[PDB]
Amino acid sequence: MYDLLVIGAGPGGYVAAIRAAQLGMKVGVVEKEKALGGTCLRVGCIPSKALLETTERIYEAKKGLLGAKVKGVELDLPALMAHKDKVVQANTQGVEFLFKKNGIARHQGTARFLSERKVLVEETGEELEARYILIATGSAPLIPPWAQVDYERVVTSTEALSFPEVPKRLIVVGGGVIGLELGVVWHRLGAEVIVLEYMDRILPTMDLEVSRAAERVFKKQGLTIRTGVRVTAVVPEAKGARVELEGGEVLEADRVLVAVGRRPYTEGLSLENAGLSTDERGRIPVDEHLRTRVPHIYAIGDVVRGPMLAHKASEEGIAAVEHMVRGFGHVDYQAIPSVVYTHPEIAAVGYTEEELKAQGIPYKVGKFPYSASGRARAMGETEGFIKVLAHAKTDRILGVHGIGARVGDVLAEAALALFFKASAEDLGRAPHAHPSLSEILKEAALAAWERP
Amino acid sequence: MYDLLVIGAGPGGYVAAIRAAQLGMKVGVVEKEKALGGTCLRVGCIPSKALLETTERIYEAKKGLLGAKVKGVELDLPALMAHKDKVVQANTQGVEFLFKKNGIARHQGTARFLSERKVLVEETGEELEARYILIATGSAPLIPPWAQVDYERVVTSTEALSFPEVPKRLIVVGGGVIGLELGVVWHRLGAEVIVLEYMDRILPTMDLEVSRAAERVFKKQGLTIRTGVRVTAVVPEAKGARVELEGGEVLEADRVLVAVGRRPYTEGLSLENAGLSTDERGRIPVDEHLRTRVPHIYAIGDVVRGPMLAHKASEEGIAAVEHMVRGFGHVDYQAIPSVVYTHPEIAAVGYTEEELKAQGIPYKVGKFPYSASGRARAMGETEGFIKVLAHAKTDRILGVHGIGARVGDVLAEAALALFFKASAEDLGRAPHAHPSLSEILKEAALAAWERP
Amino acid sequence: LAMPAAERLMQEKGVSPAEVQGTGLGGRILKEDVMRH
Ligand SMILES: Cc1cc2nc3c(=O)[nH]c(=O)nc-3n(C[C@H](O)[C@H](O)[C@H](O)COP(=O)(O)OP(=O)(O)OC[C@H]3O[C@@H](n4cnc5c(N)ncnc54)[C@H](O)[C@@H]3O)c2cc1C
Ligand SMILES: Cc1cc2nc3c(=O)[nH]c(=O)nc-3n(C[C@H](O)[C@H](O)[C@H](O)COP(=O)(O)OP(=O)(O)OC[C@H]3O[C@@H](n4cnc5c(N)ncnc54)[C@H](O)[C@@H]3O)c2cc1C
Numbered sequence: 001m002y003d004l005l006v007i008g009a010g011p012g013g014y015v016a017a018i019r020a021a022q023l024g025m026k027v028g029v030v031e032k033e034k035a036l037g038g039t040c041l042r043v044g045c046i047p048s049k050a051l052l053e054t055t056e057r058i059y060e061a062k063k064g065l066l067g068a069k070v071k072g073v074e075l076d077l078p079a080l081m082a083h084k085d086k087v088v089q090a091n092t093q094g095v096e097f098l099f100k101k102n103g104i105a106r107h108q109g110t111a112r113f114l115s116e117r118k119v120l121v122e123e124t125g126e127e128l129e130a131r132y133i134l135i136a137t138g139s140a141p142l143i144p145p146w147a148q149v150d151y152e153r154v155v156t157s158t159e160a161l162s163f164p165e166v167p168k169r170l171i172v173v174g175g176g177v178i179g180l181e182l183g184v185v186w187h188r189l190g191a192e193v194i195v196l197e198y199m200d201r202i203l204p205t206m207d208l209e210v211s212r213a214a215e216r217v218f219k220k221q222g223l224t225i226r227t228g229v230r231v232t233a234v235v236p237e238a239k240g241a242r243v244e245l246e247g248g249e250v251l252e253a254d255r256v257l258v259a260v261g262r263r264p265y266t267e268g269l270s271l272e273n274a275g276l277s278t279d280e281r282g283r284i285p286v287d288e289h290l291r292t293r294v295p296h297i298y299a300i301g302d303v304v305r306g307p308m309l310a311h312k313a314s315e316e317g318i319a320a321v322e323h324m325v326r327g328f329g330h331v332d333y334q335a336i337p338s339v340v341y342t343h344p345e346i347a348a349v350g351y352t353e354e355e356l357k358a359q360g361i362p363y364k365v366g367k368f369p370y371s372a373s374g375r376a377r378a379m380g381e382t383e384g385f386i387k388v389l390a391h392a393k394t395d396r397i398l399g400v401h402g403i404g405a406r407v408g409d410v411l412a413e414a415a416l417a418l419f420f421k422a423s424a425e426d427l428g429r430a431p432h433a434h435p436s437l438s439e440i441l442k443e444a445a446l447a448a449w450e451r452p
Numbered sequence: 453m454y455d456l457l458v459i460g461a462g463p464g465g466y467v468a469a470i471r472a473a474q475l476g477m478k479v480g481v482v483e484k485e486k487a488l489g490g491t492c493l494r495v496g497c498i499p500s501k502a503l504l505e506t507t508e509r510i511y512e513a514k515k516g517l518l519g520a521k522v523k524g525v526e527l528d529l530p531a532l533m534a535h536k537d538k539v540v541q542a543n544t545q546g547v548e549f550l551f552k553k554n555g556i557a558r559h560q561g562t563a564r565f566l567s568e569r570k571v572l573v574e575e576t577g578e579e580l581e582a583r584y585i586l587i588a589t590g591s592a593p594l595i596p597p598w599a600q601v602d603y604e605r606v607v608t609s610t611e612a613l614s615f616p617e618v619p620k621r622l623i624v625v626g627g628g629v630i631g632l633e634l635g636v637v638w639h640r641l642g643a644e645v646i647v648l649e650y651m652d653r654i655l656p657t658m659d660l661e662v663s664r665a666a667e668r669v670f671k672k673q674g675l676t677i678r679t680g681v682r683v684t685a686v687v688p689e690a691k692g693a694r695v696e697l698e699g700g701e702v703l704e705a706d707r708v709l710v711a712v713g714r715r716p717y718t719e720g721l722s723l724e725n726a727g728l729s730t731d732e733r734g735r736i737p738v739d740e741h742l743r744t745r746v747p748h749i750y751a752i753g754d755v756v757r758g759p760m761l762a763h764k765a766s767e768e769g770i771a772a773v774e775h776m777v778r779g780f781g782h783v784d785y786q787a788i789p790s791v792v793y794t795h796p797e798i799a800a801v802g803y804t805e806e807e808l809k810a811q812g813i814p815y816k817v818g819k820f821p822y823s824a825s826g827r828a829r830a831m832g833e834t835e836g837f838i839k840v841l842a843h844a845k846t847d848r849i850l851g852v853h854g855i856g857a858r859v860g861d862v863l864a865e866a867a868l869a870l871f872f873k874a875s876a877e878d879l880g881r882a883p884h885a886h887p888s889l890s891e892i893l894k895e896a897a898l899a900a901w902e903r904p
Numbered sequence: 905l906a907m908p909a910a911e912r913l914m915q916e917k918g919v920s921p922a923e924v925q926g927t928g929l930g931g932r933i934l935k936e937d938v939m940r941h
C-alpha cells in the first residue's frame with residue numbers, strides 16, 4: 001500500500017503529492033480526468049489568465065496607444081483560442097513531468113471509499129490502500145435549479161472560455177470574480193456585456209471600498225453592471241437564451257454565463273463508507289491540522305472551508321502532508337492574497353475594513369492613489385489606489401487592498417509583509433525602486449503608520 | 453536662519469526636505485534649475501520611463517499581438533513626446549505642491565559656500581545660514597575629452613530623450629543602463645542601434661549571469677551589441693557624426709549617444725570655503741552617518757559613494773535628517789534594488805555572485821526560469837529567470853537577481869525580504885498568488901533553500 | 905514574534921522562543937538565531 005493516497009490532482013492534490021514525495025512518502029494519486037492540474041489548470045486559472053492577458057493587449061490596441069496610430073485591429077479568435085489551449089497543454093504536461101520525476105504513481109478513474117483505508121478506482125477496478133488518505137476533490141460550478149444550463153447557450157465558466165464566436169450580447173449572472181473576469185474578456189472582443197448581481201455590491205471577497213471602485217471602473221469601460229437584481233430563471237432558446245428577473249423583466253442574449261458561485265465537489269466519493277459526511281454547504285469538516293473526523297484522512301482545497309483559491313489549496317496540501325510526516329503544519333490564511341485579473345487588477349490580502357469593524361478591532365487607514373504615482377503616470381495609468389489597514393495600537397498590518405494596473409503584482413509584497421507580521425512602519429521604511437508601482441504600496445504603508 | 457538648508461532639489465534633496473519638515477525642522481532648499489525634481493524628474497527616471505513604457509506597447513503592436521492582426525502601426529512622435537512632457541510636468545508640479553504643503557522655503561539659484569555655516573545664492577545675492585546643511589548636488593553626464601558632444605548630433609542622455617525624429621542609425625557609446633535603455637527606446641521606433649561597450653560585458657552593476665543573458669536577449673531583439681570595443685573618438689560631421697574605435701575602424705551615424713557614465717556634480721559649490729574637498733572620483737567623502745568631515749554638513753545621493761539611484765538618494769536623505777534630529781539613521785544598502793526598465797526588465801538586489809566569491813562567502817544558488825511559469829506562458833513570455841543567492845549555513849538571502857517581463861516589480865518583494873533579513877526558506881514558504889510572476893521568485897527561493 | 909522559518913526550526917528541535925535571542929528586524933528571531941543556540 002501507499003504511504004499516501006491523494007484523491008484529486010488539482011493545485012491541492014498535485015502539490016501535496018510532490019511535497020509528500022520530497023518528504024520520503026511513496027504517493028499514489030487518483031484523478032478521474034485525463035489531464036492533471038484540476039480546475040485551475042484545465043478550466044480555471046490558467047485558461048482564464050491566458051485569455052485575460054491577451055485580450056487586454058488587443059483591447060488597448062483598439063482603444064489606441066499613446067504616441068501611435070493603429071490603423072486596424074482584427075480579431076483572430078481561432079489563434080486566440082490556440083494560444084490558450086497551448087498554454088493549458090504545456091501546464092498539464094508540466095505536472096505530469098513533475099509526477100514522474102518525483103516517483104508519484106498516477107491512477108485514472110473515479111475514486112470511491114470502500115472503507116476508511118481502502119479506495120476503489122471504479123473505471124479500472126483497482127482497490128488501493130494507504131496509511132494516510134488526502135481528499136482534494138475540489139469544486140464544481142453552482143447551478144441552481146432555475147438556471148437551465150445546456151452547456152452551449154446557457155453555460156458555466158468552462159464553456160465561456162471557449163465560445164466559437166464572440167457573442168453579440170453576453171449576460172453574466174453573478175458579479176463575482178469569475179463573472180467579472182469572463183465578462184471583461186468578451187467585452188474586450190466586442191460583446192455587449194450585462195452583469196446582473198443580486199447583492200448591492202460586486203466582488204464579495206474584496207474590501208467594500210475596492211468593490212465599489214471596481215464597479216465604477218468597469219461601468220466606465222462599457223460593461224453594464226446592475227446590482228440588487230435577483231435573476232429568477234435562465235432558459236436556452238433558439239440561438240441564445242432568455243433571462244427573467246424578479247418582478248417580471250425579461251432579457252435576451254446570445255450567451256448567458258451562470259457564475260453564481262462554486263460548491264465543494266464530493267460526488268461519487270461515497271464518504272459514508274469512511275465514516276465521513278459533508279456539512280450544509282457540502283464541505284468536508286476538518287480540524288486545525290486539516291484532519292477530518294477520521295484522523296488518518298485529511299481534506300484540503302475547495303472541498304473544505306475557506307477561500308476557493310489555487311494557492312490556498314496548495315498551501316493546505318503542504319501543511320497536511322507536513323503534519324502527516326512531521327506532526328506539525330501551518331497555513332497563514334491572513335497572508336493569502338486574492339486577485340481579480342482584469343485591467344485594472346483588483347486585490348485583497350488580510351482583513352477587509354468590514355471584517356475589522358465586525359470584530360471591533362481598532363485600526364488606521366493609509367491610502368495612496370495611482371494618480372500620484374510617477375510610474376503610473378508614465379504608463380498612462382491614473383485610476384486606482386492601494387489601502388493599508390494597520391492596528392491602531394501595534395501598527396501591525398492587518399490588511400492591504402487595492403485596484404489598479406498590476407495591483408496584484410504589487411500586493412505580492414503585501415502578502416510577504418503579512419507573512420512576516422510586519423508593521424506599517426516596516427513596510428513603509430523598506431527600500432522601494434523609483435519609479436515603480438511598488439512605491440504606491442510604500443506610500444500607503446507610511447500613511448497608515450503616520451495616521452493619528 | 454533655517455534649521456536645515458538643502459542644496460539641490462533632486463530625489464535626495466526634496467525627500468530629505470519633506471522628511472525634515474515632518475520632523476519639525478524649518479527647511480530651506482536651494483535649486484539652480486527652474487523646476488524641482490533634479491536629474492530624475494527633469495531629464496532622468498521619469499521621462500525615460502515614460503518613453504520606455506509607451507514604446508514597448510507600440511513595439512509589441514508592430515511585432516504582432518497574440519489572437520489578432522494589426523494592419524498597421526504608425527508612430528506619432530509629437531504625441532509620444534507630448535505624453536513624456538506632460539508626465540514630467542505633472543511630477544515637477546507635484547514636488548512644488550509638497551514643498552508648499554510642508555512649509556518648505558525655496559530659493560532659486562546656484563548655492564556657493566561662503567563658510568561652514570553660510571551659503572550664497574549667486575543669482576539673488578541672498579546669504580543663507582542654517583544649523584545643518586545638506587549637500588545633494590547630484591551628478592552630470594561624464595563627457596571625456598575625446599567625445600566632442602555638440603548636443604545635437606553627438607549628445608548626452610538629455611538630448612536622446614528628445615530627438616526631433618527617429619534616427620536612421622543611433623550609435624550608443626557605453627553599454628550601461630542609460631545606454632541600453634535609450635538604445636532600446638529608439639530601436640523600438642525603427643532606428644538601427646549599435647551599442648559599443650569597452651568591457652567584456654554590459655550592465656556593470658548587474659550579476660554577471662544576468663548581464664550575459666541581457667546581452668543575448670537584446671541582440672535577439674535586433675540591437676547590435678559589440679563588447680570589448682574601446683571608442684577613441686566621437687566627432688560631429690555634416691548631418692551626423694563619426695565614431696572611431698581602437699584599431700582604426702570608423703563608424704558613422706546621424707546621431708551618437710555618449711553614455712559612458714555619470715560623475716558627481718559640485719561645480720560652483722566652492723566646497724573649500726567650508727573646509728571640504730572631493731576625492732579622486734569627484735565624490736564628497738562622508739562617514740557612517742552621512743556626515744562630511746565637517747560635523748553639521750551632510751552629503752547624500754549621486755554626489756557621494758554608492759549606486760547612483762533615485763531611491764538610494766532619497767533613503768540617504770531620510771537617514772541624514774533623522775540623524776540630525778534623533779542622532780540615529782540607517783540605510784540598508786543590501787536591500788536597495790537596481791532595475792533596468794527595458795523589456796524584459798533586468799534587476800539586482802543585494803550581492804552578486806561575483807561579490808560573494810570575492811569575499812569568500814559560501815552560498816547556495818536557487819534558479820527558476822520564466823519558461824516554467826504558468827503566468828509567463830499565459831502572457832506569451834518564456835524568456836528570463838530569477839536567481840536567489842542564500843548563505844550556505846544560515847540560509848539568509850544574500851542577493852536576488854533576474855531578467856524577464858516585469859522582473860523589477862517581482863523583485864520589490866525580494867528587496868523587502870532582504871530588508872527583513874529573511875532566509876530563502878522564509879521567502880519560499882510565503883504565500884504567493886497563483887498564477888503570478890511572483891511564483892518565479894518563490895520557486896527560486898525554495899530551490900536555494902533546498903539546494904543540496 | 906519570530907520569522908516563519910525560525911518557528912519551523914524551533915518546533916522540530918523543540919526549542920522555546922523565549923530561549924533564542926532575536927537579531928532580526930526589531931524583535932524577531934531569525935532561523936539562524938535558533939540554529940545558533
Ligand atoms: C474560471 C475559473 C478561474 C479561476 N481563476 C483562479 C485564479 O486566477 N486564481 C486562483 O487562485 N484560483 C482561481 N480559480 C479557483 C481555482 O481553480 C481553485 O481554487 C483550485 O482549482 C482549487 O484546487 P483543488 O485542488 O482544491 O481542486 P480542483 O482543482 O478542483 O481539483 C479537484 C480534482 O479532483 C478530481 N476529482 C474530484 N472527485 C474525484 C474522485 N472521486 N476521484 C478522482 N478524481 C476526482 C477533479 O476531476 C479535479 O481535477 C478559478 C476557478 C475557475 C472556475
Ligand atoms: C536618463 C537617466 C535615466 C535614469 N533612470 C533612473 C531610474 O529609472 N531609476 C533610478 O533610480 N535612477 C535613475 N537615474 C539616476 C537618478 O536620476 C539619480 O540617481 C538621481 O536623480 C540622483 O538624485 P540626487 O538628489 O542625488 O541628485 P540629482 O537628481 O542630480 O539632483 C541634484 C540637483 O542639484 C542641483 N544643483 C547642483 N549643484 C547646485 C548648486 N551649487 N546650487 C543649487 N542647485 C544645485 C541640480 O540642478 C539638480 O537639480 C537616471 C539618470 C539618467 C540621466
Ligand SMILES: NC(=O)c1ccc[n+]([C@@H]2O[C@H](COP(=O)([O-])OP(=O)(O)OC[C@H]3O[C@@H](n4cnc5c(N)ncnc54)[C@H](O)[C@@H]3O)[C@@H](O)[C@H]2O)c1
Pocket residue numbers: 173174175176177178179196197198199202203204205229230231232259260261262307308309338339340341
Ligand atoms: N482570481 C480568483 O481569485 C478567482 C477567480 C474565479 C473564482 N474564484 C473563486 O471561486 C469561487 C466561485 O467564483 P464565483 O465568482 O463563480 O462565485 P462568487 O461567490 O465569487 O460570486 C457569486 C456571485 O453571484 C451572485 N448571485 C447569486 N445568486 C444570484 C442571482 N440569483 N442573481 C444574480 N446574482 C446572483 C452572488 O451575490 C455573488 O456575488 C469563489 O469562492 C471565488 O473566490 C477566485
Ligand SMILES: NC(=O)c1ccc[n+]([C@@H]2O[C@H](COP(=O)([O-])OP(=O)(O)OC[C@H]3O[C@@H](n4cnc5c(N)ncnc54)[C@H](O)[C@@H]3O)[C@@H](O)[C@H]2O)c1
Pocket residue numbers: 625626627628629630631648649650651654655656657681682683684711712713714759760761790791792793
Ligand atoms: N534604471 C536605473 O537604475 C538607472 C538608469 C540610468 C542610470 N543609472 C545610474 O546612473 C549612472 C550612470 O549610468 P551610465 O549608463 O551612463 O554609466 P554606466 O556606468 O552605467 O555605463 C557606462 C559604460 O560605458 C562604458 N565605457 C566607458 N568608456 C568607454 C569607451 N571609451 N568605449 C566604449 N565603452 C565605454 C563602461 O565600460 C560602462 O559599461 C550609474 O551609476 C547607473 O547605475 C541607473
